[PDB]
């Protein structure tokens, strides 16, 4: 950040001052050599010692002092606050400081801040996460070096060994044809060997067959051609995702033989060292017999207008999830001019009946328009308190909390969704409080006392079994009445034989009754395990109980495969916010599974780091990132390279957009090409693992291909190359859209859901085609968009060729595909349209014009910017239907003028029917995913009533036939003959 000539001040240890002149690219060792070569001339050089006994120290733009043990790093990358350098004797450790600097750069904030904060919960989290880190390290170092090879290169295996019959019939006699390349030669001479082998063959059988046809204790392994994907663990060759995708698409698989010793040597040795901080009257809650009382003293800062608002008040409550344990209590003593209340508020809930996950949600609200019957209360700031701390002790004595601003659009006064804790910023409304002192430490009783209390307080064959099953099969967000709750709690002992009903029984229990809660604790302790996609329900905000979440985590540990974990990682990260502590079973499980799989680690890091800017969970995510980067092995360097490249890209985009928005396209292109040609940018951008896929490697940028598109947001069309030797087999180059300015997290969620709908449809037995392409969020309003090749918008199609006849798309497809290819192209186009119509109808994606919908060359179509993943751009819960236009109808009808009069039309409608019924059958999982995505902070969902629009579109209120008729009438109204 210092382009021109620099006059660096030198802060000698004897007290000298000298200003050397050096270029921006000089290194620290060169600077020290010149500095001690210039201090001899000036006085006080007798006390000066040799260079090797001294190191540097300065201050960076992040307001920290770094003692520079790494000398090879150049001056520009140091990021000094001011051009000055101080020479002091070394006091820290070489490796410790270098590692801490790398961790800080990867995270985005210095590692010294977490030592600066003195919160005992934070310190205990940092001390105790190292046990998990060490267990993961030991597990990686169990089978040397095959275990480390498995860690760095995860087998990309699907959870289902067997194949759906619609693609199992695509095999010839159940045999897969695979090309084997052997490149072992004096020169890089490529020879291929085509093998036709059964699907259930393991890699050792594949390698034996390859050797036998090569015409000759296995010293070789098999790698995907064109990517960093390896086949290591002995699993059926059809189970791997690349090979199954090749079977699905009819594409010819390609493999290649790498020596085991070559890869084993190529793997760096990973070392994990414990950091510095590794070395560095109570009575039970139930003995208390009193109500819960809390005092509110004053609001230090309040940004209220005197004229507009007269009175302001703070509203409180006791919550367990989103459900108030007791009725809310309000304060009203003083106007806005002098905020001070000093009122002992009393809650009609006994202390011994306080649940272990009890909280205290506050909000300073401003009552306006007191004149007239209607009183309007608008909140000024909100805060939450976790009445029980991480050591199982009730909060006692004086307390103070800064209060966060109310989120955009959150009208209701209390905000129990938000995270417990004070605002780190200190120029915010601070509301000092009080908690009654009980002359001792108020501790929650242990499980022995819980067990002693529990079980001591105590169609229709023998029970109403049909109603139990009906409630079980009912989705989580459906209305559950008081009669149903009483029935469920009364028949709790029989609910074990239906383990799919634990969520509903949990909602049935009365959380403000210790007898009921103890009985439910015993029931959950003896509960049988359930499906992981149902156990992920019990981690949402609606189930804050430690034992509920521990049972859900145990179920995840038992039954969560790694492909499913990578599918649900977005949500399993997002439900880290809903945790009330730092150290807990969910984060232990996720970190243990992120330090034994480098794809999980890559997306774990990038999802956690996507949310540094949000101060709400920034501290927890920063500490988690610190531990991950501490024990992530050698991948830290690749992560640092990715962070460098995206920092350069973000700076480029900012400078392009805000300083020179009025600058014309050509001049902006000139500036872009100049700054790309700039050597430090060039070096930072070349040669790093892509963030969208750790296997894909980005190579030499193509400055001629790179450009900025005509879209209003000015995104970057960045074209890389493939450094793999056999790049031609998969793809010669990588082009990626760098998007800066738009939130891509809604698109990320929509594409996750689309991928899951394909999984459901294919497992059922349909063949609908989707492209859930890659999207990543790398921070705030910044992200990566993977380009699909050979694609064109219908707007592009219409424009090309000269070119309003809706026959243009059909003519373009006919010109692209000829012969027998035409039938397959039209079939693929129709199946893609069916998937698109069903998916956009169900999720309520907004208006699609011509410019966000692309047709590939082989006839496949897909949808680009989702933007709003639900109809809340207009309203929640007539609503937005899917659209199917005249050109689509013409091509599906193979160019017939009477589109609705052909057989392919009703074939398409039947495919839509089956797809919709499959999604309506599996809507429970979609509801759980959308409800676990509540804490994202996206503008859309934010409570539950915006998730409810999926219930509306899927018609979970009606029955199956009624919903099918509803979809039929929706489709007919949609086209309305065109």
């Amino acid at each position: 950040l210092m382009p021109p000539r620099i006059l660096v001040e030198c802060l000698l240890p004897n007290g000298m001052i000298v200003t050397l002149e050096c270029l921006r690219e000089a290194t620290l060792i060169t600077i020290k050599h010149e500095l001690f070569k210039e201090a001899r001339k000036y006085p006080l050089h007798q006390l000066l010692q040799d260079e090797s006994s001294y190191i540097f120290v300065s201050v960076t733009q992040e307001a920290e002092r770094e003692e520079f043990f790494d000398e090879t790093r150049r001056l520009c990358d140091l990021r000094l606050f001011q051009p000055f350098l101080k020479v002091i004797e070394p006091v820290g450790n070489r490796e410790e400081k270098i590692l801490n600097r790398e961790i800080g750069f990867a995270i985005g904030m210095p590692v010294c801040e977490f030592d600066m904060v003195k919160d005992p919960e934070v310190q205990d989290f940092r001390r105790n996460i190292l046990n998990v880190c060490k267990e993961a390290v030991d597990l990686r170092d169990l089978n040397s070096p095959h275990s480390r090879a498995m860690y760095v290169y995860p087998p990309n295996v699907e959870s289902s060994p067997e194949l759906p019959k619609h693609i199992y019939n695509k095999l010839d006699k159940g045999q897969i044809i695979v090309v084997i390349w052997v490149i072992v030669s004096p020169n890089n001479d490529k020879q291929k060997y085509t093998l036709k082998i059964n699907h259930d063959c393991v890699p050792e059988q594949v390698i034996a067959e390859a050797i036998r046809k090569k015409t000759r204790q296995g010293k070789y392994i098999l790698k995907v051609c064109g990517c960093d994907e390896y086949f290591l663990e002995k699993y059926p060759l059809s189970q791997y995702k690349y090979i199954r995708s090749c079977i699905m698409l009819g594409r010819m698989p390609n493999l290649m033989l790498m020596a085991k010793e070559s890869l084993y040597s190529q793997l760096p040795m990973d070392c994990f060292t414990m950091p510095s901080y590794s070395r560095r009257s109570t009575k039970s809650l139930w003995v208390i017999n009193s109500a819960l009382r809390i005092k509110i003293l004053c609001a230090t800062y309040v940004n209220v207008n005197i004229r507009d608002i007269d009175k302001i008040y703070v509203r409180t409550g006791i919550y367990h999830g989103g459900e108030p344990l007791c009725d809310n209590v309000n304060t009203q003593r003083v106007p806005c001019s002098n905020p001070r209340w000093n009122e002992w508020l009393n809650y009609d809930i006994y202390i011994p009946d306080l649940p272990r996950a009890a909280r205290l949600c506050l909000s300073i609200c401003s009552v306006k328009g007191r004149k007239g019957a209607k009183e309007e209360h608008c909140p000024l700031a909100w805060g939450n308190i976790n009445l029980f701390d991480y050591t199982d002790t009730l909060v006692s004595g004086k307390m103070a909390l800064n209060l966060w601003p109310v989120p955009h659009g959150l009208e209701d006064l209390l905000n129990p969704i938000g995270v417990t804790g004070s605002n780190p910023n200190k120029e915010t409304p601070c509301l000092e409080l009080e908690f009654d002192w009980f002359s001792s430490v108020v501790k929650f009783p242990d499980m022995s006392v819980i067990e002693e209390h529990a079980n001591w307080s105590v169609e229709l064959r023998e029970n109403d079994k049909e109603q139990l099953k009906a409630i079980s099969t009912r989705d989580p967000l459906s209305e559950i009445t008081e009669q149903e709750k009483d029935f469920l709690w009364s028949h709790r002992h029989y609910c074990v034989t239906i383990p799919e009903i634990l969520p509903k029984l949990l909602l049935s229990v009365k959380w403000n009754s210790r007898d009921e809660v103890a009985q439910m604790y015993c029931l959950v302790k003896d509960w049988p395990p359930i499906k992981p996609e149902q156990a992920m329900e019990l981690l949402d905000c609606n189930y804050p109980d430690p034992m509920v979440r521990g049972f859900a985590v145990r179920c995840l540990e038992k039954y969560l495969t790694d492909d499913k974990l990578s599918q649900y990682l977005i949500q399993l990260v997002q439900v880290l916010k809903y945790e009330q502590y730092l150290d807990n079973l969910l984060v232990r499980f996720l970190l243990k599974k992120a330090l034994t799989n480098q794809r999980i680690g890559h997306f774990f890091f990038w999802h956690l780091k996507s949310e540094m800017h949000n101060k709400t969970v920034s501290q927890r995510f920063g500490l988690l990132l610190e531990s991950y980067c501490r024990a992530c092995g050698m991948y830290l360097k690749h992560l640092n390279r990715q962070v460098e490249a995206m920092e350069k890209l973000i700076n480029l985009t900012d400078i392009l957009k805000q300083e020179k928005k009025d600058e014309t396209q050509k001049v902006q292109m000139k500036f872009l090409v100049e700054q790309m040609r700039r050597p430090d940018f060039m070096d930072a951008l070349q040669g790093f693992l892509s963030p969208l896929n750790p296997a894909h490697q980005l190579g030499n940028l193509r400055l001629e291909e790179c450009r900025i598109m005509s879209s209003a947001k000015r995104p970057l069309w960045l074209n890389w190359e493939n450094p793999d030797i056999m790049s031609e087999l998969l793809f010669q180059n990588n082009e990626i859209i760098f998007k800066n300015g738009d939130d891509l997290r809604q698109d990320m969620l929509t594409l996750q859901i689309i991928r899951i709908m394909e999984n459901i449809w294919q497992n059922q037995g349909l063949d609908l085609r989707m492209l859930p392409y890659g999207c990543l969020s790398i921070g705030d309003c910044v992200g990566l968009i993977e380009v699909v090749r050979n694609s064109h918008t219908i707007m592009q199609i219409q424009c090309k060729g000269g070119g309003f006849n809706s026959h243009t798309l059909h003519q373009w497809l006919k010109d692209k595909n000829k012969g027998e290819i035409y039938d397959a192209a039209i079939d693929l186009f129709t199946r893609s349209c069916a998937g698109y119509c069903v998916a956009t109808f169900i999720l309520g994606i907004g208006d699609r014009h011509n410019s966000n919908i692309m047709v590939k060359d082989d006839g496949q179509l897909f949808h680009i910017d989702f933007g709003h993943f639900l109809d809340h751009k207009k309203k929640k819960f007539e609503r937005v239907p899917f659209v199917l236009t005249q050109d689509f109808l013409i091509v599906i009808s193979k160019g017939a003028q009477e589109c609705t009069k052909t057989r392919e039309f009703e074939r398409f409608q039947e495919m839509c029917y089956k797809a919709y019924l499959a999604i309506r059958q599996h809507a429970n999982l979609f509801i759980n995913l959308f409800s676990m995505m509540l804490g994202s902070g996206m503008p859309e969902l934010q409570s539950f009533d915006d998730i409810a629009y999926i219930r509306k579109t899927l018609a979970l209120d009606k029955t199956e036939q009624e919903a099918l008729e509803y979809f039929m009438k929706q489709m007919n109204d949609a086209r309305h003959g065109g």
């Binding site: 007290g15 000298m16 201050v59 307001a63 606050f81 209220v304 608002i309 309007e376 009445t481 008081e482």
Partner: protein, 283 residues
Amino acid sequence: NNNMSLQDAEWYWGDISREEVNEKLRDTADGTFLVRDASTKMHGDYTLTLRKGGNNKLIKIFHRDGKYGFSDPLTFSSVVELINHYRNESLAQYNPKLDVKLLYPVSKYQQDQVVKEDNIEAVGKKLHEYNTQFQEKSREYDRLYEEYTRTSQEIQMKRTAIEAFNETIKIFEEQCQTQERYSKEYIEKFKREGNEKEIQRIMHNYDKLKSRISEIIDSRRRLEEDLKKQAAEYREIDKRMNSIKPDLIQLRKTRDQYLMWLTQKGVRQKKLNEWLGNENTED
């Protein structure tokens, strides 16, 4: 009286979603209730929502052989009779925990009479004017919020910068203290020796150091003053936001009230869509 039209009953609302039920019963006292048609749309369900303990409790009215009731056996003739009886008497007999009456019934007639200028052209013109006011207030609020976010970012970065200046000053002052500690003895020894070249060189270095420290102090002070000014602007923008939110809420509420009044007149919903804003407005 005891058994009149369920449609004429004021607690009856018709086909409203549970979301609208929760919106209507948000932050209301105990005993509040309304009766709406069931979401399942199966005839005879008639879910009743009573708010006890701060929660929108749900109780379902079983319908059998021309009778109504909460649970078997059914002993009541009609929904109106059930509602009136449990308004008169509490629910403790039905459920021992549910010790509450049905005190405050939500009525659709109050909103019927609150709206003024009932004629069609008047409600249309008022709807248009209030929609324009609502759009103006919404764009003002969005601009205010983006300005607030920008100012918060500026405050955070300037606080980091001022902390960095404090650290720089600490380093410089420690170095100058070390310089004086060494230079006292050094200057004393060279004064004993009797030469002035190194003395003047050391003095030149010391005044150069002092000038640099003074410059950094001046820059830090200027940054701190700018930080105070930006903090004042941030507080002013927060005050304007807190002032402008209630007016936007009231405009939205009255616009929706006018929309519902217009729709409850038999006029075309296509005309409603065309007239309102035919735009991305929520309602």
